[PDB]
């Protein structure tokens, strides 16, 4: 699943600290407060979601929903290009 | 209905001025140390979620907050609440979670301009230190400093009345209406 | 079940997950203090308390469904039906403690420790301790128990964490 | 090439043009995301995040620079003339800014300083004085009216009521938008 | 009882500015090495509890601290001490635990603004290095650096008088009042 | 009382609790220096000094009330009444030393060791190890606490000085 | 005074420099003998046991101290200048440390902390989580990759992948090492 | 006096910044391997006690250290040494134990701010690897890395002058004043 | 020469002695230490100068080759290339695998092996190999178990060493 | 005083204290090298070299005053007056070696062994001193090598201790 990992890494690299805090707030229902405090990048949160099967390479619904919330349609296009 | 995403959109429609107003209106429930890092709406919501004052089944305090800051657009769009409804809900005794003393103070800030704020600061030279009378302070911060110095409160409106009597009379109208309402 | 499965589970956990796994099994291994997770799982396997279903329950409590699928070849339905059909290895009290710990950040745990020093003292203060370390200290001092949660509830209420107080009340009503 | 071009376009825009562009982009960028936008380039960045401005899609940037009447930048950096834009905006499609927004902005183009004072004084019944300060322009007043649900696509009553006192040419634009 | 709960509630009503002020006011009792890691109010309390200056039976120093930072609201609410009482308690010779030299300095920080602080820094270029005169330093850190370089003290107020006279005359009034009591 | 109780106690204590338990019993195991906790308990039972009440007092001093309830089936008041009734196995001096050690972090213990090196001639040791070293040099004793008191005052730990003064006044 | 010189060189060596030296000596000192190396003198002794460091053979020590860019120690205690070392290491064959090692070390020299975090995240599927702790440095990750025969002199695909994920200068370093072969 | 208690009090009045300054100023006497574990002042003192540079009868190096870090308060309080006195003692040839080259470098660190330090780091990208130019490094660590790469030294000040000439001009004056004494 | 054996035994650490004892396991009675083993070997005539040189080469003590036997790496390497070895390649492979394992890897490897053997004390990899030999679990013609265990601890390089040895036979 | 006294001393001593006692008594009985402390004390008692004063000096040198008070009913002043009045069992050279060992950590001893191994051929400093004595490298009249090695490990305080011993000799 190396392409999915590189997709998650690219999405994480294209995020800001404020966007990271927004994603943390959005994922508070799925990830605890302490684990969210341990998150220092988008890839950390994506890895935690991948360990919980909330985000799979064949089930990108959560990632697309999070990116649609943040209105990051370019990252949505990246995800769609991955789906190809 | 995604509760978290709805809160995120509401926060996305709020600038720093509305955030400062909401933080002031939530002073009776969130202490100064917890309020200092609040630089966005989301974090504020989080604190309210920790006090069980904001959940998917209890939107009363969020509606009250957005109504007091006159964000009726957010109420109608994301909370499905019109202007009249909240009014009736706030006419019932006990259903108001924001104290009438707080709202009154905020309403005073609604009627003060820039030069009026400068005059309000000049009127407090002999009661408040100059470090708290800087030009970067807004009227709510001045109210907070007065409360810290036990100069403003529910039982101490004398200095507020005096300073308001120097700039405009509608401010005394609001103060005395809240006072007689007690 | 074999040593390879235990090794795979142990190698795919971080320090915090290891600490949580050790905490959850404190009531099934009271007759031993396991030093690490590998020794804990080995002890559970020797005593017959680490079957495939028990390891699945442990992985379910740490929410490592990737390990459930990859190592034990199980999904959510399998582990949930196993927990519905058989007695649990970890009591709901330990799960509640772990949940409360997951919903507390560093500052919250620090403030919680500050409230406890009136009723227990500073205690173990060599390092910054997690919420589970505080729970272990309170257990060693007979201050918290499945039938004794009033103190933790009051302290969580005092740090403005009413949601965790509601979790405690929900557990109380579940009995 | 392209990023340098966007940087040059942003460098050729002053604060008034920036405020006009931020108002014209309200239907796609919320208030919180607009607050830290203190230069044109930053604005462009946000548009690049919503896929409304890319190297292959310059339509929205052209529309913005045409609506703000900055034809010099269009001709210099985008190689686009006035007639071209007119033809592009005459199509029923290809319009990304709502007709309600443009109309409102056009009203701000036709009001003077004393007219702005009269507009401020005409709304003391529904808006507080702190939002009707002597430094607010007409776009901020429009935003506050929308916040207090007195101005909108379906509520133009107070807009016409206040516009009729100052001048009648504003009602012309309002009725032209209405016939759409 | 809930002594630690009361201390925690008092700390929750204190922001970082109040914490810096309290740390400055406790300099004569807590050395620099112990002051560096103090990043919240509770920590400060801990150090005081180690010197027996904060106990369930000894709130005198805590009351003095909360009075000097003009947090009279906290005094009245959590310590049941009004402003007048504290005044009386600080007029008796020997009951003041914070030195009159220290308090005076803090009061100067109450009357200096941003431009006044930068002028104060510009007045100390030939006595303090640039790294210690950075634009992020406040007036209390400047006082601390001056004390480190033995230009400010109980028996040496000349340089302080010089810079204050270059900036304002009310600061000379505060200095001269502290001197005349001495 | 049996040997299974000793085994359960030995297997249910952590390293710090074992180290503290060995320190508290230094005044009853003088001729012999027990290598570990199990051997210490075996010696105490061999000498007849490990009854149910003695082991209960030991668990009470190491603050392991969970073991008191689970293994010896006793509560706090029961052990307190036992301590009020019979003479104690562990003197108040050892309890004071352990309490002061429990309220000291690594930095405080390091600074305290730095001050003591003037009166006594290399790894990170606990406070109880420092107390043992001072005892081996006749520098601290139930009737000789002035040096430890002064050193605790000099490291700005006045609360522990007050604990020492309370111990001195109770005698 | 040879032993005194070795002791003085070791006293001027930090723990990070020691880890770098241990990594650059991996092709000559195996992991079991390398684990207890917590001082420079121990590394020196181990090299003396393989006759790679003697009173007359300072070549490997000079190469090590040059690759860690400790030119001060080279000039003061080994009496060798930077240009001299450059000349001697440009000759084909006198290099005892492989170009693969130097390349890896330079990559570790050009990766920052956040870059190291992204590196660890990019190797989640290939390395066990317990080995991706925040205390692991990039050289330890390289060693773990070599353990799994995923990184090597002829195998650079995953290395290039992660480097392209993080930075382009690392790809340039890899390509410069490749064109040397 | 009491020597251990005096050293302990001196160390308690020193924060981590002063400790880093002292460790830098003691580089010519304490090697890097022994410098790495030094996380408090007392440890440093111990190392000096091992070289007999700090003992009950030899405070000269300790006085010089506390003078170079401008801690005259500790000098007068615990070492009973005035500001002028040290000057005299340090003007005598060969009485100064800290080299003029070292002190000079430290003084440069006193005149560089945070943004100036960032520009200084940006000025050495072609000569120092990125891992050693992280935002955690202070100017003294950059000097140490430059010395390791033999680009900074007593006879090698060319790169130092080059980098200083782009951030500030007084640093070139300090460098040239130290240089002319050679 | 017999005076050399005493010097060799004196100038060796515990790990090197244990490894040396392991390599000579294939040549009756079990000698207690290295001195007695070397005495028995040179008594039976199976320990010439070249054999001791090979032994010192396997424990990687070239300084001893220079000081005691006055030989370098090249001489013993050509000697091993030209005549048959005293220590089989299986023992050399085991020693190489042991030297390329850290304490954590050795611990994890022992943890995997305890399913197939008992509980042997902090023992090295060579002690584990000796126990597995005593239990008929590892042998020059039976490396599948050790190879599988090395694969499970992500030591594919050592698995490749085992595969290369199996290819050479 | 009896065999019970020897048993109590052997049982109460620490491991480092036992090793130090053996090192300090290495110069008394060289016919036999005692393996442990119990055998050493038995040999001393048999040879008549374990009086009250001898055991008092031994416990004083290992800095074990609690045992002096508990077993021999003596304080520091008594043993010091005895050492000033009567001849010593342990020479000042052994005491100097033990003091230097006590002021050396494991890294210091490691670097010292690394420097010393050129002149000879995890050990403690006392084991290194014993080997150096068996190789005629250190002696009460031969301390220049150890002194210079301590100077090279930047331990000038121990060099001055050695200088003080040399001044104490003449």
Numbering used by the authors:
A (entry chain L): 1 to 84
B (entry chain D), E (entry chain C), H (entry chain B): 1 to 182
C (entry chain K): 1 to 175
D (entry chain E): 2 to 181
F (entry chain J): 1 to 121, 126 to 175
G (entry chain A): 2 to 182
I (entry chain H): 2 to 28, 31 to 123, 127 to 175
J (entry chain I): 1 to 121, 128 to 176
Question: How is this structure described in the published paper?
Answer:
Fas-associated protein with death domain (FADD), procaspase-8, and cellular FLICE-inhibitory proteins (cFLIP) assemble through death-effector domains (DEDs), directing death receptor signaling towards cell survival or apoptosis. In this work, we present the crystal and cryo-EM structures of ternary FADD-Casp-8-cFLIP DED complexes, unveiling FADD-FADD, FADD-Casp-8, FADD-cFLIP, Casp-8-cFLIP, and cFLIP-cFLIP DED assemblies in a complex. The atomic coordinates depict how FADDDED and Casp-8tDED could assemble a helical 1:5 and 3:3 intermediate complexes, and how these FADD-Casp-8 intermediate complexes are targeted and capped by four cFLIPtDED molecules. The resultant helical Casp-8tDED-cFLIPtDED hetero-double layer appears to locally activate Casp-8.
We successfully reconstituted the ternary complex FADDFuL_H9G-Casp-8tDED_F122G/L123G-cFLIPtDED_H7G complex, henceforth referred to as the FAFuL_H9G-C8FGLG-CFH7G complex. Subsequently, we obtained the protein crystals and determined the crystal structure at 3.1 Å resolution using the MR-SAD method, in which FADD DD is not visible. Notably, the crystal structure reveals a 1:5:4 stoichiometry for the FAFuL_H9G-C8FGLG-CFH7G complex. This complex represents a single-FADD ternary DED complex, which fits the corresponding SAXS envelope. The single-FADD complex structure unveils additional FADDDED-Casp-8tDED assembly, in which Casp-8tDED assembles a type III-II-III CSS-mediated pentamer, containing Casp-8tDED molecules C8a, C8b, C8c, C8d, and C8e. Although the only FADDDED molecule FAl uses distinct surfaces to interact with three different Casp-8tDED molecules C8a, C8d, and C8e, these interfaces are too small, which are ~330 to ~500 Å2, to form 1:1 FADD-Casp-8 complexes for intermediate complex formation. Instead, the III-II-III CSS contributes larger interface areas, which are ~780 to ~820 Å2 corresponding to the buried surface area (the BSA) of ~1560 to ~1640 Å2, providing Casp-8tDED the ability to self-assemble transient oligomers. These oligomers then form a composite-binding site (CBS) with a larger interface area of 835 ~ 1,280 Å2 to interact effectively with FADD, promoting the formation of a FADD-Casp-8 intermediate complex. In the 1:5:4 FAFuL_H9G-C8FGLG-CFH7G complex structure, three Casp-8tDED molecules C8c, C8d, and C8a provide, respectively, a type Ia, a type IIa, and a type IIIa surfaces, while FADDDED molecule FAl provides a type IIa and a type IIIa surfaces to complete the CBS to recruit cFLIPtDED_H7G molecule CFk. In the single-FADD structure, the halt of Casp-8 filamentation at the upper end results from the inability of the CSS of Casp-8tDED molecule C8e to bind and stabilize another Casp-8 tDED when there’s no FADD in the adjoining space.
